[PDB]
Amino acid sequence: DIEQRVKQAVAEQLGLKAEEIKNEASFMDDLGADSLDLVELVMSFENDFDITIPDEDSNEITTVQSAIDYVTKKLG
């Protein structure tokens, strides 16, 4: 249930809905998330998935698919 954890974390953190979250939905462009919700969201991503995300690819996360594609391959 990677899809439920990823979508639930974003929807729960910002008060949005998992079904309203799209794969091609930009975080800053649509939700207007700043680095506070993006750094904290990836902060929670590290605690829940147990992986590390450097700023090298951190600056590449722009859409929901960036979060899922990168963490799905980073899980193992």
Summarize the structure.
63% of the residues lie in helices and 0% in strands. The chain is mainly α.
Describe the structure.
There is one protein chain. The relative contact order is 0.20. The protein has five helices and no strands. The radius of gyration is 11 Å and the shape is globular. It has helices spanning 2-14, 27-31, 35-49, 55-58, 64-74. It is an all-alpha fold and 76 residues long. The longest helix is centred in the middle third of the chain and has 15 residues, at 35-49. Helix 1 (2-14) packs across helix 5 (64-74). It has one domain: Non-ribosomal Peptide Synthetase Peptidyl Carrier Protein, Chain A (Orthogonal Bundle), CATH 1.10.1200.
Topology readout:
Elements: H1 2-14, H2 27-31, H3 35-49, H4 55-58, H5 64-74
Structure keywords:
Non-ribosomal Peptide Synthetase Peptidyl Carrier Protein, Chain A; phosphopantetheine; ACP; mainly alpha; ACP-like_sf; Ppantetheine_attach_site; 0% strand; globular
CATH class: Mainly Alpha
CATH architectural type = Orthogonal Bundle
* Number of helices, counting only DSSP H or I runs of 4 residues or more: 5
Rg, rounded, reads 11 Å
| Main pleated-sheet profile | none
Q: Which structural class matches the secondary elements?
A: mainly alpha
At the third CATH level, what is the topology name? Non-ribosomal Peptide Synthetase Peptidyl Carrier Protein, Chain A
Give the ordered list of helices and strands: HHHHH
**Portion in beta strands:** under 5%
Task: Report the principal-axis shape.
Answer: globular
- Distance between the ends: 15 Å
Relative helix content: 55-70%
Mind telling me the CATH superfamily name? ACP-like
> Using DSSP, what is the number of strands?
0
Question: How many domains make up the coordinates?
Answer: 1
